[PDB]
Amino acid sequence: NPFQFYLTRVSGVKPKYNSGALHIKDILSPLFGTLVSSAQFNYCFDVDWLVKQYPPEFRKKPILLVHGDKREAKAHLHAQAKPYENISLCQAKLDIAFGTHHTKMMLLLYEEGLRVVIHTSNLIHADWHQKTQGIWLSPLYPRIADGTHKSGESPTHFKADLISYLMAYNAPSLKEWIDVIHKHDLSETNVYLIGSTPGRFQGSQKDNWGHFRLKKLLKDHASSMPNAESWPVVGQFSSVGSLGADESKWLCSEFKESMLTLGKESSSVPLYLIYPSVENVRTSLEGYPAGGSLPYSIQTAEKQNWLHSYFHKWSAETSGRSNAMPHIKTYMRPSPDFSKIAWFLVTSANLSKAAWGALEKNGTQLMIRSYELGVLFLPSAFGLDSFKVKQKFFAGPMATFPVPYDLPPELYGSKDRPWIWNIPYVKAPDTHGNMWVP
Ligand SMILES: O=C(O)c1cnc2c([N+](=O)[O-])cccc2c1O
């Protein structure tokens, strides 16, 4: 495979469904490189657990933790790290209310080169235990020889886009990593970077982030096919924000409009949203506690019941993960019979205005509250017109894309309800014998 898209290992499925999966210990093993320094961008950290995932010989190398915590949460994280002299912290600035640092990324500096890992898991035991999570692994990027002048840039502009993303933090500890990236050759990268950073973007900066970044890439590097209006859009996420009183406020007006872009020329396109039902969570490997990582509140949900008609159950027989609740987020554009896809995106961005951006000031300004990061797989970047869908995720032409859940997605039944984490479920017990009482 040329895609280097992996799922995390799931405890409890048969070995066939973990064969090509990765645990964090595998990512940090010496087989992937001789570690000199690393940067861990994330939302939630368990520092004691994290350090034990590094191999013993690497546990004293410098680690930078990039986080968004403030006030007491920030103090708690500093206290967690205090015992480990080699750990530094970088607080990402969040100057817009209700912003979060959701980006999940590792920068791994080796003796032999550099690797970038963009993924969806928090750095806590439970996120790597029985969840469906996604990982993109970069190639080993070699160092550019001292005295040599070359860009080290890929046809997807990944090196410049990653530096641009890091420059948005305006942070001294990340300027060091920017200088490291400058000195490496990233020309073999075949994915496009799609990031969100907080701010209000107009003019030449409007296309840099969020769903306008996606729109711009799809206009420039995908081609429209006849009957494009028949190719659905699929979104798959672990959390939903407040989208407004109806679909025309944001979901189908600006979000779906960005996602249905193809090619340069100027809607009944179906929209499938995949989000775990209550039954999905109850019968999961973790049981109801899996819902602790699916933070859809009743307050938000009650304001947008129109949205739930779009919801489809989580099903993942193709990867043996129907009972491993998703914390991956993915977006893609399948053909009407779901045998091909025009593109695939894996990201930290949930279905929310905070992450993807919302238009302001008479449509002239895109406002984003949070940091997010994902990678976009475009057929043109692999010399193809479209991707064939792999029929079994862990099965064996390597030009077929490993989609991790079942297609077509299955609509909620009439008795199904979206998982809502702050109401009780006491009618039927979960796989551990328990109810859910918030
Ligand atoms: O991975 C993330 O980016 C992320 C962010 N926030 C979460 C919350 N929360 O408090 O919003 C509750 C539960 C799980 C969360 C999570 O998994």
Coordinates of C-alpha atoms and ligand atoms in Angstrom, one line a residue:
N1 CA 0.0 0.0 0.0
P2 CA 1.1 3.6 -0.7
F3 CA -1.4 5.2 1.6
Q4 CA 0.1 4.4 5.0
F5 CA -3.2 4.8 6.8
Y6 CA -3.5 2.5 9.8
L7 CA -6.0 1.8 12.6
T8 CA -4.9 1.4 16.2
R9 CA -4.8 -2.0 17.7
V10 CA -8.0 -3.1 19.5
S11 CA -7.8 -5.4 22.5
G12 CA -10.3 -8.2 22.2
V13 CA -10.7 -8.7 18.4
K14 CA -9.1 -11.7 16.7
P15 CA -5.5 -11.4 15.6
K16 CA -6.5 -11.1 11.9
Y17 CA -8.0 -7.7 12.7
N18 CA -4.9 -6.4 14.4
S19 CA -2.3 -7.7 11.9
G20 CA -1.8 -4.4 10.1
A21 CA -2.8 -2.3 13.1
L22 CA -0.5 -0.1 15.2
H23 CA -0.2 0.5 18.9
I24 CA 1.7 3.6 20.2
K25 CA 4.5 1.3 21.4
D26 CA 5.0 0.2 17.8
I27 CA 5.1 3.8 16.5
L28 CA 7.8 4.7 19.1
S29 CA 9.8 1.5 18.8
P30 CA 13.4 1.7 17.7
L31 CA 12.4 -0.2 14.5
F32 CA 10.9 3.1 13.3
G33 CA 14.1 5.2 14.0
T34 CA 16.6 6.0 16.7
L35 CA 14.9 8.8 18.6
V36 CA 16.6 12.0 19.4
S37 CA 13.6 14.3 20.3
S38 CA 9.9 14.3 19.9
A39 CA 6.9 16.7 20.0
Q40 CA 3.5 15.4 21.1
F41 CA 0.6 17.6 20.0
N42 CA -2.6 16.6 21.7
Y43 CA -5.7 17.4 23.7
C44 CA -5.6 15.1 26.7
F45 CA -2.4 13.7 28.3
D46 CA -1.5 11.1 30.9
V47 CA 2.2 11.8 31.2
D48 CA 3.1 8.8 33.3
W49 CA 1.4 6.5 30.8
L50 CA 2.9 8.4 27.9
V51 CA 6.5 8.1 29.0
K52 CA 6.1 4.3 29.5
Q53 CA 5.1 4.0 25.8
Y54 CA 8.6 5.1 24.8
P55 CA 11.2 2.3 24.7
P56 CA 13.3 2.3 27.9
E57 CA 16.4 3.5 26.1
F58 CA 14.5 6.5 24.7
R59 CA 12.6 7.6 27.8
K60 CA 15.0 10.4 28.7
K61 CA 15.1 12.0 25.3
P62 CA 13.5 15.5 25.2
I63 CA 9.7 15.5 24.8
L64 CA 7.7 18.7 24.0
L65 CA 4.0 18.5 24.9
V66 CA 1.8 20.9 22.9
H67 CA -1.5 21.5 24.7
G68 CA -4.4 24.0 25.0
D69 CA -5.0 23.9 28.8
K70 CA -5.4 27.1 30.9
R71 CA -5.7 28.0 34.6
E72 CA -6.2 24.9 36.9
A73 CA -6.1 22.4 34.0
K74 CA -2.7 23.9 32.9
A75 CA -1.5 23.6 36.5
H76 CA -2.5 19.9 36.6
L77 CA -0.6 19.2 33.4
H78 CA 2.5 20.9 34.7
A79 CA 2.3 18.9 37.9
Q80 CA 2.0 15.7 35.8
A81 CA 5.2 16.5 33.9
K82 CA 7.2 18.0 36.9
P83 CA 8.7 14.5 37.8
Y84 CA 10.2 14.2 34.2
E85 CA 13.1 16.6 33.7
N86 CA 13.2 16.0 29.9
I87 CA 9.6 17.1 29.3
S88 CA 8.8 20.6 28.2
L89 CA 5.4 22.1 27.6
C90 CA 4.0 24.6 25.0
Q91 CA 0.7 26.2 25.7
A92 CA -1.1 26.9 22.4
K93 CA -2.7 30.3 22.4
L94 CA -6.5 30.2 22.3
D95 CA -7.6 33.8 22.0
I96 CA -11.2 33.1 20.8
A97 CA -13.8 32.0 23.3
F98 CA -14.6 28.2 23.5
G99 CA -11.6 27.2 21.5
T100 CA -9.7 24.0 22.0
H101 CA -6.4 22.4 20.9
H102 CA -7.6 19.2 19.2
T103 CA -4.7 18.5 16.8
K104 CA -3.1 15.1 17.4
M105 CA 0.3 14.8 15.9
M106 CA 3.8 13.5 16.7
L107 CA 7.0 15.0 15.3
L108 CA 9.7 12.3 15.7
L109 CA 13.3 13.4 15.2
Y110 CA 15.7 10.5 14.6
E111 CA 19.4 10.1 14.0
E112 CA 18.3 8.8 10.5
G113 CA 15.7 11.5 9.6
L114 CA 12.3 12.9 10.6
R115 CA 8.9 11.3 10.8
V116 CA 5.5 13.0 11.1
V117 CA 2.5 11.1 12.6
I118 CA -1.0 12.6 12.3
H119 CA -3.6 10.6 14.2
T120 CA -6.8 10.8 16.2
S121 CA -6.0 9.4 19.7
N122 CA -5.5 11.2 23.0
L123 CA -2.4 10.2 24.9
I124 CA -4.3 8.2 27.5
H125 CA -4.6 4.4 27.9
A126 CA -8.3 4.2 27.0
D127 CA -7.9 5.9 23.6
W128 CA -5.6 3.1 22.5
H129 CA -7.4 0.2 24.1
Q130 CA -10.7 -0.6 22.5
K131 CA -11.6 2.3 20.2
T132 CA -11.5 2.7 16.4
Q133 CA -8.7 5.3 15.8
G134 CA -6.9 6.4 12.7
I135 CA -3.1 7.0 12.0
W136 CA -1.3 8.4 9.0
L137 CA 2.5 7.7 9.1
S138 CA 4.8 9.8 7.0
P139 CA 7.8 8.3 5.2
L140 CA 11.2 8.6 7.0
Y141 CA 12.3 12.0 5.7
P142 CA 16.0 12.3 5.2
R143 CA 18.1 15.3 6.3
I144 CA 19.2 17.7 3.5
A145 CA 23.0 17.7 3.3
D146 CA 24.7 20.7 5.0
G147 CA 25.6 23.1 2.2
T148 CA 23.0 21.8 -0.2
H149 CA 20.2 24.1 -1.3
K150 CA 17.0 22.4 -2.3
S151 CA 13.3 22.9 -1.3
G152 CA 12.6 19.4 0.0
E153 CA 9.0 20.1 -1.0
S154 CA 6.4 17.6 -2.2
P155 CA 4.0 18.1 -5.1
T156 CA 1.3 18.4 -2.4
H157 CA 3.1 21.4 -0.8
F158 CA 3.1 19.4 2.5
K159 CA 6.4 20.8 3.8
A160 CA 5.3 24.5 3.4
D161 CA 1.8 23.7 4.7
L162 CA 3.1 22.0 7.8
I163 CA 5.5 24.9 8.5
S164 CA 2.6 27.3 8.0
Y165 CA 0.5 25.4 10.5
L166 CA 3.3 25.5 13.1
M167 CA 4.0 29.2 12.5
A168 CA 0.4 29.9 13.5
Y169 CA 1.2 29.0 17.1
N170 CA 3.8 31.9 17.3
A171 CA 5.6 29.7 19.9
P172 CA 9.4 29.6 20.5
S173 CA 9.5 25.8 21.1
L174 CA 7.8 25.2 17.8
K175 CA 10.2 27.6 15.9
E176 CA 12.8 25.0 16.9
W177 CA 10.8 22.3 15.2
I178 CA 10.2 24.5 12.2
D179 CA 13.9 24.8 11.8
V180 CA 14.2 21.0 12.0
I181 CA 11.5 20.6 9.3
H182 CA 13.4 23.1 7.1
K183 CA 16.5 20.9 7.2
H184 CA 14.6 17.7 6.0
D185 CA 13.5 16.5 2.6
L186 CA 9.7 15.9 2.6
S187 CA 9.4 15.6 -1.2
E188 CA 8.0 12.0 -1.1
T189 CA 4.8 13.1 0.7
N190 CA 1.6 12.3 -1.3
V191 CA -1.1 13.7 1.1
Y192 CA -2.4 17.2 1.5
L193 CA -2.4 18.9 5.0
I194 CA -5.8 20.3 6.1
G195 CA -5.5 22.3 9.3
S196 CA -7.6 24.6 11.4
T197 CA -6.1 27.3 13.6
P198 CA -8.0 29.9 15.6
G199 CA -8.7 33.3 14.1
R200 CA -10.7 35.4 11.7
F201 CA -9.5 35.0 8.1
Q202 CA -10.3 37.2 5.2
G203 CA -8.9 37.8 1.7
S204 CA -5.8 35.9 0.8
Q205 CA -6.0 33.9 4.1
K206 CA -9.6 32.7 3.8
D207 CA -8.5 29.6 1.8
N208 CA -5.8 28.6 4.3
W209 CA -7.8 26.8 6.9
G210 CA -10.9 24.7 7.7
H211 CA -13.6 23.9 5.2
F212 CA -12.4 26.6 2.8
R213 CA -9.0 24.9 2.7
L214 CA -10.8 21.7 1.7
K215 CA -12.8 23.5 -0.9
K216 CA -9.7 25.1 -2.4
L217 CA -7.9 21.7 -2.6
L218 CA -10.9 20.0 -4.2
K219 CA -11.3 22.8 -6.7
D220 CA -7.6 22.7 -7.7
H221 CA -6.7 18.9 -7.5
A222 CA -9.9 16.9 -8.1
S223 CA -12.0 16.7 -11.3
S224 CA -15.8 16.7 -11.6
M225 CA -17.3 13.6 -13.1
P226 CA -20.7 13.4 -14.9
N227 CA -23.5 12.7 -12.5
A228 CA -21.4 14.2 -9.8
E229 CA -24.7 15.2 -8.1
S230 CA -25.2 11.5 -7.5
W231 CA -22.0 10.9 -5.6
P232 CA -22.9 11.2 -1.8
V233 CA -20.9 12.9 0.9
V234 CA -20.1 10.9 4.0
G235 CA -19.1 12.4 7.4
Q236 CA -18.2 10.3 10.4
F237 CA -17.4 11.8 13.7
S238 CA -17.4 11.4 17.5
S239 CA -19.0 14.7 18.6
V240 CA -21.5 17.2 17.2
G241 CA -21.6 20.9 17.8
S242 CA -24.5 23.3 17.8
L243 CA -25.3 23.5 14.0
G244 CA -28.3 25.9 14.1
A245 CA -32.0 25.7 14.0
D246 CA -32.1 24.0 10.6
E247 CA -29.9 22.5 7.9
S248 CA -29.7 25.8 6.0
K249 CA -27.9 27.6 8.8
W250 CA -24.5 25.9 8.3
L251 CA -24.6 22.2 7.6
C252 CA -26.0 22.2 4.0
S253 CA -25.3 25.9 3.2
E254 CA -21.6 26.3 3.7
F255 CA -20.2 23.0 5.1
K256 CA -21.8 20.6 2.5
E257 CA -21.2 23.2 -0.2
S258 CA -17.4 23.0 0.5
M259 CA -17.5 19.2 0.7
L260 CA -19.3 18.7 -2.7
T261 CA -16.7 20.8 -4.6
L262 CA -15.0 19.0 -7.5
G263 CA -12.9 20.7 -10.1
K264 CA -12.9 24.3 -11.3
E265 CA -16.4 24.9 -12.7
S266 CA -19.4 26.4 -11.0
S267 CA -28.3 20.5 -4.3
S268 CA -29.7 16.9 -4.2
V269 CA -26.3 15.3 -3.2
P270 CA -27.1 12.8 -0.4
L271 CA -25.4 13.4 2.9
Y272 CA -24.7 10.4 5.2
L273 CA -23.6 11.2 8.7
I274 CA -22.2 8.3 10.8
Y275 CA -22.5 8.6 14.6
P276 CA -22.9 5.9 17.2
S277 CA -26.5 5.1 18.4
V278 CA -27.2 4.3 22.0
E279 CA -27.3 0.6 21.1
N280 CA -23.9 0.9 19.4
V281 CA -22.5 2.2 22.7
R282 CA -24.3 -0.2 25.0
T283 CA -23.2 -3.3 23.1
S284 CA -19.6 -2.0 22.6
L285 CA -16.5 -3.6 24.0
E286 CA -16.2 -0.8 26.6
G287 CA -20.0 -0.6 27.2
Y288 CA -21.6 2.6 28.3
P289 CA -18.2 4.1 29.4
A290 CA -17.3 4.4 25.7
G291 CA -19.9 7.2 25.7
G292 CA -17.6 9.2 27.9
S293 CA -15.6 9.9 24.7
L294 CA -18.7 10.8 22.6
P295 CA -19.6 14.1 24.3
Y296 CA -22.9 15.1 22.6
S297 CA -24.9 16.9 25.3
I298 CA -28.7 16.8 25.6
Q299 CA -28.7 20.6 25.7
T300 CA -27.2 20.8 22.2
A301 CA -29.1 17.9 20.8
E302 CA -32.6 19.1 21.8
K303 CA -32.0 22.3 19.8
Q304 CA -31.4 20.4 16.5
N305 CA -33.6 17.3 16.3
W306 CA -33.7 17.9 12.5
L307 CA -30.1 16.7 12.4
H308 CA -30.7 13.2 13.6
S309 CA -32.6 12.2 10.4
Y310 CA -29.2 12.3 8.8
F311 CA -27.6 9.8 11.3
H312 CA -26.4 6.3 10.4
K313 CA -25.2 3.7 12.8
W314 CA -21.5 2.7 13.3
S315 CA -20.8 -0.5 11.5
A316 CA -17.3 -1.8 10.8
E317 CA -17.4 -5.5 9.9
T318 CA -14.8 -4.8 7.2
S319 CA -12.2 -4.2 9.9
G320 CA -13.7 -6.3 12.7
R321 CA -14.5 -3.1 14.6
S322 CA -18.3 -2.8 14.9
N323 CA -17.9 -3.0 18.7
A324 CA -14.9 -0.7 18.9
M325 CA -16.5 2.8 19.2
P326 CA -15.1 5.4 16.8
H327 CA -12.9 8.2 17.9
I328 CA -11.5 8.6 14.4
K329 CA -13.2 11.2 12.3
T330 CA -13.4 10.8 8.5
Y331 CA -15.0 12.5 5.5
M332 CA -15.2 11.1 2.0
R333 CA -16.9 11.3 -1.4
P334 CA -18.1 7.8 -2.5
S335 CA -19.6 6.9 -5.9
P336 CA -23.4 6.2 -6.0
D337 CA -22.8 2.5 -5.5
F338 CA -20.0 3.1 -2.9
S339 CA -17.5 1.1 -5.0
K340 CA -15.2 4.1 -5.6
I341 CA -14.3 7.2 -3.7
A342 CA -13.2 10.6 -5.1
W343 CA -11.2 11.5 -1.9
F344 CA -10.8 10.5 1.7
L345 CA -10.0 12.8 4.7
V346 CA -8.9 11.6 8.2
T347 CA -8.8 14.3 10.8
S348 CA -9.3 15.4 14.4
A349 CA -12.2 17.7 13.3
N350 CA -15.6 16.8 14.5
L351 CA -18.9 18.0 12.9
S352 CA -18.8 21.5 14.4
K353 CA -18.4 25.2 13.4
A354 CA -15.6 25.5 16.0
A355 CA -13.4 23.1 14.0
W356 CA -14.3 23.7 10.4
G357 CA -15.1 27.4 10.6
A358 CA -18.2 29.5 10.1
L359 CA -18.6 32.5 7.7
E360 CA -18.9 36.0 9.3
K361 CA -19.2 39.6 8.1
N362 CA -21.4 39.1 5.0
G363 CA -19.5 36.0 3.9
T364 CA -16.1 37.8 3.8
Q365 CA -14.5 36.3 6.9
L366 CA -14.0 32.7 8.1
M367 CA -13.9 32.4 11.9
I368 CA -12.3 29.3 13.5
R369 CA -12.1 28.7 17.2
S370 CA -9.9 25.6 17.5
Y371 CA -6.7 23.8 16.3
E372 CA -7.3 20.8 14.1
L373 CA -5.3 18.7 11.7
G374 CA -6.0 16.0 9.2
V375 CA -4.6 14.6 5.9
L376 CA -6.4 14.5 2.6
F377 CA -6.0 11.6 0.1
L378 CA -6.7 12.7 -3.5
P379 CA -6.5 10.2 -6.4
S380 CA -4.6 12.8 -8.5
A381 CA -1.8 12.7 -6.0
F382 CA -1.4 8.9 -6.7
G383 CA -1.8 9.2 -10.5
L384 CA -5.4 8.0 -10.4
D385 CA -8.9 9.2 -11.3
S386 CA -10.6 7.6 -8.3
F387 CA -9.8 5.1 -5.5
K388 CA -11.3 1.7 -5.5
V389 CA -12.7 0.8 -2.1
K390 CA -11.0 -2.1 -0.4
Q391 CA -13.6 -4.8 0.3
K392 CA -11.9 -6.0 3.5
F393 CA -9.8 -3.5 5.4
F394 CA -7.1 -6.0 6.4
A395 CA -7.2 -8.1 3.2
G396 CA -5.1 -8.1 0.0
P397 CA -3.8 -4.2 -6.6
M398 CA -2.5 -2.0 -3.8
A399 CA -4.3 1.0 -5.4
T400 CA -7.5 0.3 -3.4
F401 CA -8.2 2.5 -0.4
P402 CA -8.7 1.0 3.0
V403 CA -12.0 2.5 4.2
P404 CA -12.3 1.4 7.9
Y405 CA -16.2 1.0 8.2
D406 CA -18.9 -0.6 6.2
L407 CA -20.6 0.9 3.1
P408 CA -23.3 1.8 2.5
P409 CA -23.9 3.2 5.9
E410 CA -27.1 2.0 7.6
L411 CA -29.7 4.5 8.6
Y412 CA -30.9 4.6 12.2
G413 CA -33.9 2.5 12.8
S414 CA -37.1 4.0 14.2
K415 CA -36.2 3.0 17.8
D416 CA -32.6 4.1 17.5
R417 CA -31.4 7.3 19.2
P418 CA -28.1 9.1 19.0
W419 CA -25.7 8.6 21.9
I420 CA -26.1 11.6 24.2
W421 CA -23.6 11.4 27.1
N422 CA -25.3 13.4 29.9
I423 CA -28.7 11.6 30.2
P424 CA -29.2 8.2 31.9
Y425 CA -29.6 4.8 30.2
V426 CA -31.2 2.3 32.7
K427 CA -33.4 0.2 30.5
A428 CA -30.8 -2.4 29.4
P429 CA -27.3 -3.2 30.8
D430 CA -24.1 -2.9 28.8
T431 CA -21.5 -5.6 28.1
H432 CA -20.1 -5.3 31.6
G433 CA -23.5 -5.5 33.3
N434 CA -23.8 -1.8 34.1
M435 CA -26.2 1.0 33.4
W436 CA -25.3 4.6 32.7
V437 CA -26.2 7.2 35.3
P438 CA -24.5 10.6 34.7
Ligands
LIG1 O1 -10.1 14.0 21.4 C1 -10.6 15.1 21.6 O2 -10.2 16.1 20.9 C2 -11.7 15.3 22.7 C3 -12.0 16.6 23.0 N1 -12.9 16.8 24.0 C4 -13.5 15.8 24.6 C5 -14.5 16.0 25.6 N2 -14.8 17.4 26.0 O3 -14.8 17.7 27.1 O4 -15.1 18.2 25.1 C6 -15.1 15.0 26.3 C7 -14.8 13.7 25.9 C8 -13.9 13.4 24.9 C9 -13.2 14.5 24.3 C10 -12.3 14.2 23.3 O5 -11.9 12.9 22.9

